[PDB]
Write a protein that binds this ligand. Structure first.
Ligand code: CLA
Ligand code: CLA
Ligand code: CLA
Ligand code: CLA
Ligand code: CLA
Ligand code: CLA
Ligand code: CLA
Ligand code: CLA
Ligand SMILES: CCCCCCCCCCCCCCCC(=O)OC[C@H](CO[C@@H]1O[C@H](CS(=O)(=O)O)[C@@H](O)[C@H](O)[C@H]1O)OC(=O)CCCCCCCCCCCCCCC
Ligand SMILES: CCCCCCCCCCCCCCCC(=O)OC[C@H](COP(=O)(O)OC[C@@H](O)CO)OC(=O)CCCCCCCCCCCCCCC
Ligand code: SF4
Ligand code: SF4
Lengths: 74, 741, 157, 94, 41, 80, 35, 143, 31
């Protein structure tokens, strides 16, 4: 019972809500335990990089599926 | 001791002093309308006599007078119905041609092009087609002329005036005392024999001397203006003997115990009349006479002013077993001192009775030319279904009200109520499990069929062609009823209804009644009905059982019966009161009744209603229910989409009104969502801004505008939701049946 | 005068009641003789019995209702399906054991209805559940395998 | 609990005052035959470890992939089977 | 008589009477001057 | 475990204490009001968050405030 | 398409093996007591 | 001069036939509460868990799950039978902790000698702005 | 000229490497 690593108060919840709120507040970095401004900005910057990689992967997947099982040439 | 008439003289003065002082009945509404919430509170507690006074005598007097007022209102409504049928109808013309002329009893004025609603019903008359079945009722009663309808309307007005006078007299002049109301034995004895028994006997007498001869001549074929008047048959045994020979013997066979002589007009045939399509009036006469005798005999069981008779308290206290400890002790005190408990029992049985009435009326059409009137049949069935559902929900609500206000632990110790309240957890848990099991095994079957049909695997569906789910029990019962005549009912010439099986009863080229075959679709829809009824029962029962206390809130009884919550603590206590359970039960009841009426409509349009062309029966929808009702897509396309073309194409015709309401209802329903998904804080702040705007122009009202309370918001949302949904179904049903019926 | 409904073990302030469904002599005997209520039997053997019964009763449904029920090779396909279901409920048992038993705590004692002190069931332990889970796998797979053999044998069927 | 009368609370016997009863449990070591018990405990010898028991479950995962790449084709699944002709579409398309 | 006139002056009675009077006036305007799409003066 | 706070606007009417269903508030001597008493929350661990105390406070604005925070087995009102 | 056998292996892996493994790991991690 | 009264385990319980709304498994691994009162006569009362019990003539002891249930029963006894009771908290290990009448005096009555815990000396709108306490696991009411 | 099987295999391997980089970034973000 300590999954919400970013929220010590939520980890003490002995009900199923702990899991629920443990997922709905994962991106609210400003409300996490021991969070500063520098760490907040750095985490957001890394998250931006991850999102960009996800977008690139999505586009690559679309292209690969069209070139593998599509009829683009026809 | 000793049942008697105890009354108090002039208890309340008759004047308009309190009419000019709104909120006089409530003590909390005395500080005046400081906020707009006072206006809503004035109407939300107008009939809550339990709060206006702590005396049971005054509450009983108020209830008695309110009953008289309601009776007067019903009499006014009946008078209006008869007057409209006598002055703005085509009943006389409809009598000469009841199979082609469509009944109509309403005429609209030409103001803004609305005269288009005056349809060409027939018989040189223009008006709105009615589906209340009043024409069939009047024909069964032998009205024949319009003067009789006018006389009945005037008599109904006189009765309404008498009812209102009775209420005023019993509340301001001669008010009965509490001991007079607590005479359950006398009340039951009079309501069983003096009311039901005497009324049934009187109706049987009227049917014998008025309905039988007039209807017999009408069926044989005689102009309505040529049939003798009712008094010519009621006071002339010669003519009535010409129609029924057993009458040449008078009343001698009745007193000599030779009742067989009366077998000509007191038959036990069965089935329906092949000419009119309804039940044999002789059979109805015999039925009313038998039930009248039974009720009169039953009205002599309870003890009153003599030694003979039984005691309700004695009978209740004597029914106790090893599994119920004390038994029914304390029930007599609860039912003789609490109006809410009696209201709950009466509402439950009353709604159940209404549902049973709807079933028995479509199965066995009791009026002539009623079965062939598809619009009237569908309308009557749906109307009674809705009335029954509403009454049942109200029964649950009042049961919870009694448990919250009139419950007393010192009087209910180790009895049925106490033992039930001591194991509510087991009851609720088991009901919850059965509801989940029913939901799965009922809806998941439809979902599985939808998935298989979409995947191109019709052989893996739950249909009559693939995995069959035949209702063997229902089919067995149906065949048993079909084989009842001559075996388990030797004196019966035919079955009670043609639905059990047999030939097809058609009148005027239209099928009045025919056997109703049950298949996999019927099995699925019946389990859906059982599941919905179980969920509604679970909600209502949970509210009644936990209205006093609960593990989450141990003092729920102190908060009352109608409260919004207990704050956001403990995770949230929103809608924890019994009133909220009733609020949710209303939605579930609406869902259940909606599915029931949809099933009835589709089944009758696909396997019953139709036309006979000497080569078979051409049903309205062609029997697509047996092949499409096993999937949700079939219900959406073959029933909702296919049958809605009649209401969406009614513009520019007489049914245009049905097309307008169909849309209007859709609006109201959606409107309800605003009150169901919102909260009071948002509206209060918005009102704050609007109030600032008003104050800026010196136009702010002293009666501070306030947002509707949480409970009021829920009530408004539920009322609008049900009004919109029911009105939508009403418009759709009426337009479809009036365009293809 | 008899009262067949009494509070659980005479205590009327415990969320339970004794009824002819829970305290019935025959019902109590049958329920107590199940492999789950054997504090003195090894968890592995009880798990083997439970798995055997569950695996055997789990073939039938897919045999008579599976997508390939109208094919002669339905018995084999269903045997494999039951094996897969047993493996799934196997990982379920393992996950439950790994989550439930991961710590120790001075729990309260356990007594019988008469008041005789008894030790806690060894099944409610880290090693007890692991042994029970292992037996359930062997028994569950064996039950599914026996389900296929019964289809081939059994002269009536 | 010392429920000899109407007392259902006892600090010296708090174990019985909280309803901590087995209700149906019964300790008995005389039941399964020794020869059959040995066979089963022997069959499930090393399968009592989390890593080893998970390995058995991993076999089920391999069977799932084996079915898709071989089992599905051997049962003549419609998705792994062939296709017959086609349609043109609403207008002049494909 | 004073109490009766006071009751007739209440918000619901006055609201229903005002709505009825306005509706009646509009109905008669449309009865004598029907299909008034534009303000043709 | 919610946060309950009392402010100097309190008039010592003791209504919030009587409205508490878990005995979380109590009256202690004070000298800032005519009643010479102030409200306090020594047992906030037993507070469930029903906010019944706020519905009974007559001061404007409220002199007693409840801020819902971390949920525990007692604050959630769980009997199982 | 080239390598027709790939979908028959990747679809069950992403829809059956990967989800079961992910759910089991997540369930074991969200109830660790000491992560 | 007040001391917490010890909890007597010899106190009989009220006459009750049993119910399914009583103690569950939480009382065996977490805690439960006990309410003891003194009645001048044997009379029927309503239990917070559903049903009706009969309190004996003399000392009565009742074990419930949550503290709110005990307080609700105490409120019923005080407003209906004018009976004063004591609430204790019992843990599985065997520790009893006095509760509600903490100092023998009801909380609604000032006793002069209590702890003025959680009492801010400012107004509700005089709290620090949320932006001034950012990046700190505290709300404006805790400053 | 449809893509051959070797191209699909190469793409899958490169995707595996990309997934490894992604899991490394996720682990770094968790810290
Ligand atoms: C109790 C139910 C009931 C209902 C729902 C209706 C409904 C209707 N009636 Mg009816 N009526 C009823 C009872 C009822 N009536 C009874 C008991 C009688 C016998 C006295 C009548 C006698 C009656 C007549 C003579 C007429 C109607 C008419 C009408 C229609 C137009 C009414 C109107 O707008 O007039 C005007 C609206 C007003 C607010 C003014 C009413 C002024 C009266 C005098 C108030 C009396 C109190 C309407 C559909 C009219 C109709 O059918 O048109 C073809 C028509 O002429 N009714
Ligand atoms: C002209 C005759 C008359 C007069 C002057 C009074 C006068 C009085 N009555 Mg009384 N009463 C009368 C007739 C009369 N009553 C009749 C005929 C009945 C039988 C129904 C009653 C039954 C009765 C009861 C049970 C009670 C009173 C009470 C009272 C007193 C205050 C309540 C009140 O009137 O508020 C004003 C009432 C109104 C302005 C009208 C009430 C609403 C009507 C009835 C609704 C009608 C429905 C209508 C069709 C609309 C519904 C549908 C619509 C949406 C289209 C008051 C001095 C009450 C009392 O004593 O106070 C403690 C009391 O409880 N009366
Ligand atoms: C043979 C005797 C008799 C009859 C026929 C009735 C009939 C009725 N009673 Mg009643 N009652 C009786 C005896 C009787 N009662 C006795 C002895 C007691 C005391 C124990 C009561 C106490 C009682 C109460 C408390 C209530 C009734 C109510 C009702 C009405 C129920 C409405 C309904 O569904 O019916 C159908 C409706 C009709 C058939 C309308 C026609 C009405 C006709 C005129 C029948 C009138 C019968 C009447 C008793 C005649 C004597 C009155 C006379 C002095 C003028 C109904 C008309 C309820 C009610 O609604 O109040 C009015 C109700 O609240 N009764
Ligand atoms: C309440 C229902 C009712 C009523 C009002 C009538 C009324 C009538 N019936 Mg009738 N009847 C009925 C039910 C009824 N019947 C039923 C259910 C049957 C089936 C068994 C019959 C079968 C029947 C036959 C076969 C005949 C009649 C006939 C008659 C007429 C003369 C008989 C008579 O005794 O005068 C009126 C009766 C009363 C006024 C009843 C008063 C009660 C007692 C006797 C008087 C008061 C009590 C006393 C003072 C003590 C008369 C108008 C005869 C007739 O003339 O045909 C048209 C005829 O031959 N009836
Ligand atoms: C014989 C039937 C009957 C009777 C006598 C009562 C009597 C009573 N009920 Mg009850 N009830 C009933 C049936 C009945 N109910 C049914 C069938 C239901 C299920 C819906 C309910 C559900 C219910 C609830 C949830 C509550 C009551 C309450 C009450 C009490 C106060 C009622 C009041 O003054 O509120 C005021 C009455 C009104 C404001 C009338 C408003 C009418 C509705 C909102 C409009 C509906 C529109 C209508 C269909 C026409 C639409 C056209 C429109 C566009 C103009 C009262 C003693 C209340 C209580 O506190 O009990 C003590 C309570 O909260 N009832
Ligand atoms: C998203 C991935 C996914 C995949 C790849 C599958 C794949 C499959 N499903 Mg499934 N399903 C899924 C999601 C998925 N499903 C979801 C989300 C739901 C819930 C809506 C369902 C609900 C569902 C039902 C209700 C059923 C299936 C069935 C099937 C099987 C088709 C019938 C067949 O091939 O004969 C049989 C299949 C086999 C012989 C191979 C499976 C056994 C392997 C080899 C396990 C090896 C372990 C070994 C014993 C050790 C097939 C293996 C049907 C079935 O047959 O059940 C299995 C069937 O009844 N599915
Ligand atoms: C903002 C919405 C709106 C507007 C601007 C209009 C405008 C108009 N409507 Mg319409 N209508 C509406 C909503 C609206 N309607 C809705 C919601 C409905 C459904 C109920 C209808 C149903 C409807 C019908 C059935 C008819 C109209 C008609 C008319 C026209 C008649 C003008 C008139 O009455 O003569 C002049 C009126 C006056 C000079 C009176 C002015 C003084 C009054 C009394 C002041 C009122 C003070 C409060 C007019 C252009 C009629 C028409 O002929 O269409 C062309 C007609 O038949 N409407
Ligand atoms: C986000 C882009 C994306 C999406 C939505 C899909 C979707 C799909 N792919 Mg595909 N794929 C992608 C990228 C993507 N792919 C890329 C970049 C490649 C090149 C290596 C492939 C190579 C590939 C092959 C060879 C096959 C599929 C197949 C499929 C289908 C079944 C899924 C499966 O089991 O295969 C598994 C997919 C992979 C093993 C590689 C996908 C890896 C992507 C990039 C992960 C992206 C994660 C995302 C960014 C994070 C979101 C969080 C989420 C995981 C919770 C499915 C419709 C199968 C098919 O054709 O069905 C008929 C098939 O055999 N894909
Ligand atoms: C993709 C990845 C696939 C992974 C596959 C893992 C397979 C399991 C594994 O390796 O376990 C490793 C363990 C290690 O045990 C160890 O066995 C050791 C002996 S030896 O090393 O195996 O010789 C022993 O010393 C030690 O105590 C014990 O822990 O070995 C076993 O005990 C496996 C034996 C499995 C026997 C049961 C098979 C199923 C029976 C079904 C019955 C009905 C069927 C009809
Ligand atoms: C399909 C049938 C439709 C009804 C739904 C049945 C499901 C409901 C199950 C809930 C049971 C709860 C047990 C309460 C336990 C309980 O109430 O206590 C036991 C109860 C108490 O009786 P006592 O000995 O106390 O009797 C004294 C009484 O006067 C006081 O109550 O006796 C009963 O056994 C009632 C029968 C319950 C069983 C009802 C089933 C009846 C069978 C009907 C079959 C109809 C179809 C077949 C006909 C051929
Ligand atoms: S929120 Fe409820 S429990 Fe908490 S202090 Fe206020 S009244 Fe007491
Ligand atoms: S309710 Fe408000 S004013 Fe009254 S004692 Fe409590 S905090 Fe003070």
């Amino acid at each position: 019972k300590l999954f919400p690593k970013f929220s010590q108060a939520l980890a003490q919840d002995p009900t199923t809500r702990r899991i629920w709120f443990g997922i709905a507040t994962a991106h609210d970095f400003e409300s996490h335990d021991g969070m500063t401004e520098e760490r907040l900005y750095q985490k957001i910057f890394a998250s931006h990089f991850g999102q960009l990689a996800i977008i690139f992967l999505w586009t690559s997947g679309n292209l690969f599926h069209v070139a593998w099982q599509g009829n683009f040439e026809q | 001791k000793k049942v008697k008439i105890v009354v108090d003289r002039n208890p309340v003065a008759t004047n308009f002093e309190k009419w000019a002082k709104p909120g006089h009945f409530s003590r909390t509404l005395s500080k005046g309308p400081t906020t707009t919430t006072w206006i809503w509170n004035l109407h939300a507690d107008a009939h809550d006599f339990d709060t206006q006074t702590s005396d049971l005598e005054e509450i009983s007097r108020k209830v008695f007078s309110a009953h008289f007022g309601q009776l007067g209102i019903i009499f006014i409504w009946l008078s209006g119905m008869y007057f409209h049928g006598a002055r703005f109808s085509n009943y006389e013309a409809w009598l000469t041609d009841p199979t082609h002329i469509k009944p109509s009893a309403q005429v609209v004025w030409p103001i803004v092009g609305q005269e288009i609603l005056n349809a060409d019903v027939g018989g040189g008359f223009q008006g709105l087609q009615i589906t209340s079945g009043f024409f069939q009722l009047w024909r069964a009663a032998g009205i024949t002329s319009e003067l009789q309808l006018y006389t009945t309307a005037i008599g109904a007005l006189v009765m309404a005036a008498a009812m209102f006078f009775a209420g005023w007299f019993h509340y301001h002049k001669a008010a009965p005392k509490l001991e007079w109301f607590q005479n359950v034995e006398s009340m039951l004895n009079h309501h069983l024999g003096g009311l039901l028994g005497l009324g049934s006997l009187a109706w049987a007498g009227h049917q014998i001397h008025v309905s039988l001869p007039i209807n017999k001549l009408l069926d044989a074929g005689v102009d309505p203006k040529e049939i003798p008047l009712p008094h010519e048959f009621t006071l002339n045994p010669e003519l009535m003997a010409q129609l029924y020979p057993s009458f040449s013997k008078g009343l001698a066979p009745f007193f000599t115990l030779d009742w067989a002589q009366y077998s000509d007009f007191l038959t036990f045939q069965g089935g329906l009349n092949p000419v009119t399509g309804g039940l044999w009036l002789t059979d109805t006469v015999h039925h009313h006479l038998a039930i009248a005798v039974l009720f009169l005999i039953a009205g002599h069981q309870y003890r009153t002013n003599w030694g003979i008779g039984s005691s309700l308290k004695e009978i209740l206290e004597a029914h106790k077993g090893p599994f119920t400890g004390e038994g029914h002790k304390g029930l007599y005190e609860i039912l003789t001192t609490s109006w809410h408990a009696q209201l709950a029992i009466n509402l439950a049985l009353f709604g159940s009775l209404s549902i049973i009435v709807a079933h028995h009326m479509y199965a066995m059409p009791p009026y002539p030319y009623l079965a062939t009137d598809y619009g009237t049949q569908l309308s009557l069935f749906t109307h009674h279904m809705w009335i029954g559902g509403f009454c049942i929900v109200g029964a649950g609500a009042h049961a919870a009200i009694f448990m919250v206000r009139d419950y007393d632990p010192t009087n209910n110790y180790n009895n049925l109520l106490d033992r039930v309240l001591r194991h509510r957890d087991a009851i609720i848990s088991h009901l919850n499990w059965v509801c989940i099991f029913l939901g799965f095994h009922s809806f998941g079957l439809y979902i599985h069929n939808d998935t298989m049909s979409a995947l191109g695997r019709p052989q893996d569906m739950f249909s009559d062609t693939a995995i069959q789910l035949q209702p063997v029990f229902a089919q067995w019962v149906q065949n048993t009823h079909f084989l009842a005549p001559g075996f388990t009912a030797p004196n019966a010439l035919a079955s009670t209804s043609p639905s059990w099986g047999g030939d097809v009863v058609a009148v005027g080229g239209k099928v009045a009644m025919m056997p109703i075959s049950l298949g996999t679709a019927d099995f699925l829809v019946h389990h859906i009905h059982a599941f919905t009824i179980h969920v509604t029962v679970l909600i209502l029962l949970k509210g009644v059982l936990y209205a006093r206390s609960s593990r989450l809130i141990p003092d729920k009884a102190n908060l009352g019966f109608r409260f919004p919550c207990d704050g956001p603590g403990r995770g949230g206590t929103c809608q924890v009161s019994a009133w909220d359970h009733v609020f949710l039960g209303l939605f579930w009841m609406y869902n259940s009744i909606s599915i029931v009426i949809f099933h009835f409509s589709w089944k009758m349009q696909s396997d019953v209603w139709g036309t006979v062309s000497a080569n078979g029966v051409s049903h309205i929808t062609g029997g697509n229910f047996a092949q499409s009702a096993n999937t949700i897509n079939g219900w959406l396309r073959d029933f909702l989409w296919a049958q809605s073309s009649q209401v969406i194409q009614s513009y520019g015709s007489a049914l245009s009104a049905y097309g307008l309401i169909f849309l209007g209802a859709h609006f109201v329903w959606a409107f309800s969502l605003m009150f169901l998904f919102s909260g009071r804080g948002y509206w209060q702040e918005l009102i704050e801004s609007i109030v600032w705007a008003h104050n800026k122009l010196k136009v702010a009202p002293a009666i501070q505008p306030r947002a509707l309370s949480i409970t009021q918001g829920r009530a408004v949302g539920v009322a609008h939701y049900l009004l919109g949904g029911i009105a939508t179904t009403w418009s759709f049903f009426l337009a479809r049946i009036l365009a293809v019926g | 005068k008899v009262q067949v409904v009494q509070p659980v073990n005479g205590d009327p302030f415990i969320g339970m009641l004794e009824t002819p469904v829970t305290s019935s002599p025959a019902i109590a005997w049958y329920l107590s003789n199940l492999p789950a209520y054997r504090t003195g039997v090894s968890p592995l053997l009880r798990g083997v019995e439970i798995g055997l019964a569950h695996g055997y009763l789990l073939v039938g449904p897919f045999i008579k209702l599976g997508p390939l029920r109208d094919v002669e090779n339905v018995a084999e396909i269903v045997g494999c399906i039951n094996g897969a279901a047993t493996v799934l409920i196997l990982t379920l048992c393992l996950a439950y054991g790994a989550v439930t038993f991961q710590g120790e705590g001075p729990q309260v004692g356990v007594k019988t209805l008469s008041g005789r002190s008894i030790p806690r069931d060894p099944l409610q332990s880290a090693d007890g559940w692991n042994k029970f889970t292992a037996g359930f796998a062997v028994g569950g797979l064996s039950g599914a395998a026996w389900g296929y053999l019964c289809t081939q044998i059994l002269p009536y069927y | 609990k010392y429920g000899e009368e109407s007392r259902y609370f006892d600090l010296k016997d708090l174990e019985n005052t909280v309803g901590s009863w087995d209700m149906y449990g019964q300790e008995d070591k005389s039941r399964y035959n020794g020869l059959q018990s040995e066979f089963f405990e022997r069959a499930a010898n090393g399968l009592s470890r989390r890593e080893y028991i998970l390995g058995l479950v991993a076999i089920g995962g391999a069977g799932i992939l084996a079915w898709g790449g071989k089992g599905a084709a051997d049962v003549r699944l419609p998705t792994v089977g062939p296709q017959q002709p086609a349609q043109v579409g609403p207008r002049g398309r494909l | 008589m004073k109490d009766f006139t006071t009751y007739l002056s209440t918000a619901p009675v006055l609201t229903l009477l005002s709505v009825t009077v306005v509706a009646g006036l509009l109905i008669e305007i449309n009865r004598f001057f029907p299909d008034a799409l534009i303000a043709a003066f | 475990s919610h946060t309950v706070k009392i402010y100097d606007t309190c008039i010592g009417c003791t209504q919030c204490v009587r409205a508490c269903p878990t005995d979380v508030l109590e009256m202690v001597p004070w000298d800032g009001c005519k009643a010479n008493q102030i409200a306090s929350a020594p047992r906030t661990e037993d507070c469930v968050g029903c906010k019944r105390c706020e519905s009974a406070c007559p001061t404007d604005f409220l002199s007693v405030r409840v801020y819902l925070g971390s949920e525990t087995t007692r604050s959630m009102g769980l009997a199982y | 398409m080239s390598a027709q056998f790939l979908p028959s292996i990747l679809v069950p892996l992403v829809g059956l093996v990967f989800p079961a493994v992910a759910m089991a790991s997540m369930f074991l991690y969200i109830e660790k007591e000491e992560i | 001069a007040f001391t917490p009264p010890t909890l007597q385990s010899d106190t009989p319980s009220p006459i009750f036939g049993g119910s399914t709304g009583g103690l569950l498994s939480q009382a065996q691994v977490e805690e439960f509460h006990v309410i003891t009162w003194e009645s001048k006569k044997e009379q029927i009362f309503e239990m917070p868990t559903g049903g009706a019990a009969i309190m004996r003539q003399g000392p009565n002891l009742l074990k419930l799950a949550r503290k709110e249930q005990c307080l609700a029963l105490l409120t019923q006894l005080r407003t209906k039978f004018k009976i004063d009771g004591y609430i204790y908290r019992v843990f599985p290990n065997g520790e009893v902790q006095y509760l509600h009448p903490k100092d023998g005096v009801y909380p609604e009555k000032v006793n002069a000698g209590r702890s003025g815990d959680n009492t801010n000396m400012r107004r509700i709108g005089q709290n620090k702005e949320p932006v001034q306490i950012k990046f700190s696991g505290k709300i404006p009411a805790e400053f | 000229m449809p893509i051959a099987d070797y191209q699909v295999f190469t793409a899958l391997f490169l995707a595996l490497a990309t997934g490894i980089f992604a899991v490394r970034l996720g682990v770094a973000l968790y810290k």
